[PDB]
């Protein structure tokens, strides 16, 4: 089954939270902790019969790319995931050719480490290889939308059986660790999908989202 609810945005989404820990599971939420005026994330009816409702992430107001932890479309999942492989799929439309759209799947309620900083725990994108991809995130997947004004399939596999302890690249972060997810890991019981379009000036629309065990 699709684990994402309101997958085609047939129900209007307006709920904003200031932290995913406050989001009601099984619903979409809007995270926009960027400064007032930087981005607008909102529900829309598109006029396109194939994707008639969508979320629009509009970075027209941005002077800089937006932050991974500040501005995104999210959905918290508390149904209890299995250690296994999952596919996340959706359709996206960009105002400008080449605009990226992005994904990560993060633990909702993190503990702090010995040094007082919140952990950042993510499921590993399945194709991550730290040796071959020293400059890439192991958590966040990015896909360039090649054409403007065209609904485009976005597909990424995640391994819920592996986690990474940072969103940063291996080269940038000697503390980065990939590990096997514990059977009792908190992330399996309470996580959220984040869909983002961070580029300054870009406008990305999102519709028809699926998360499925494969
Ligand atoms: Na705004």
């Amino acid at each position: 089954q699709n684990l994402i609810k309101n997958e085609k945005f047939a129900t209007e989404v307006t709920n904003k939270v200031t932290n995913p820990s406050k989001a009601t599971a099984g619903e979409w939420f809007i995270m926009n902790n960027e400064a007032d005026g930087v981005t607008t994330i909102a529900w829309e009816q598109t006029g396109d019969a194939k994707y008639p409702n969508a979320m629009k992430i509009d970075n027209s107001g941005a002077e800089k790319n937006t932050s991974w932890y500040k501005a995104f479309l999210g959905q918290r999942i508390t149904d209890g995931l299995e250690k296994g492989i999952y596919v996340l799929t959706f359709y996206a439309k960009a105002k400008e050719a080449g605009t990226p759209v992005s994904v990560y799947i993060k633990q909702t309620n993190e503990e702090k480490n010995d040094n007082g900083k919140l952990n950042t725990t993510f499921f590993m994108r399945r194709d991550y290889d730290a040796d071959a991809q020293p400059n890439a995130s192991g958590a966040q997947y990015n896909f360039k939308i090649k054409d403007a004004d065209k609904w485009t399939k976005v597909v990424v596999y995640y391994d819920m059986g592996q986690v990474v302890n940072a969103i940063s690249s291996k080269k940038s972060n000697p503390a980065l660790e990939v590990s096997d997810t514990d059977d009792d890991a908190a992330i399996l019981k309470d996580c959220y999908v984040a869909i983002l379009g961070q580029n300054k000036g870009g406008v990305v629309e999102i519709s028809d989202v699926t998360l499925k065990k494969k």
Side-chain angles (χ1 to χ4, degrees), residues 6 8-13 42-56 93 151 205-207:
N6 190 24
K8 286 174 176 64
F9 305 101
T11 299
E12 181 172 8
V13 174
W43 183 86
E44 64 175 350
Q45 296 200 285
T46 62
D48 297 327
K50 286 189 45 68
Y51 302 101
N53 309 276
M55 300 299 298
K56 181 187 281 193
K93 200 174 153 283
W151 286 107
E205 298 165 88
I206 292 144
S207 194

Side-chain angles (χ1 to χ4, degrees), residues 61-63 65-113 116 118-149 151-157:
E63 291 170 0
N65 294 346
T66 62
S67 167
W68 68 267
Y69 61 90
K70 298 186 189 179
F72 55 95
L73 173 68
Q75 183 164 140
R76 184 181 182 172
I77 303 178
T78 55
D79 289 317
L81 299 176
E82 294 168 77
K83 312 212 309 196
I85 64 169
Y86 289 75
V87 64
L88 184 77
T89 73
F90 57 94
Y91 285 82
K93 200 174 153 283
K95 178 174 155 198
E96 283 88 42
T99 301
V101 64
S102 309
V103 175
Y104 62 78
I105 311 180
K106 191 175 185 294
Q107 181 167 333
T108 308
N109 285 320
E110 301 268 17
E111 299 296 312
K112 281 163 153 63
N113 78 356
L118 280 177
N119 292 335
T120 59
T121 312
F122 305 85
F123 294 121
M124 192 189 89
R125 69 185 173 81
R126 201 159 180 245
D127 277 320
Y128 181 55
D129 178 329
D131 299 310
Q133 302 180 316
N135 296 308
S137 184
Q140 182 164 319
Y141 171 75
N142 306 302
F143 185 63
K144 292 178 316 183
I145 296 161
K146 182 187 62 269
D147 295 330
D149 299 332
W151 286 107
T152 301
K153 187 184 200 76
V154 184
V155 178
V156 55
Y157 278 67

Side-chain angles (χ1 to χ4, degrees), residues 32 35-41 58:
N32 185 356
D36 177 272
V38 169
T39 180
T40 298
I41 299 176
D58 182 346

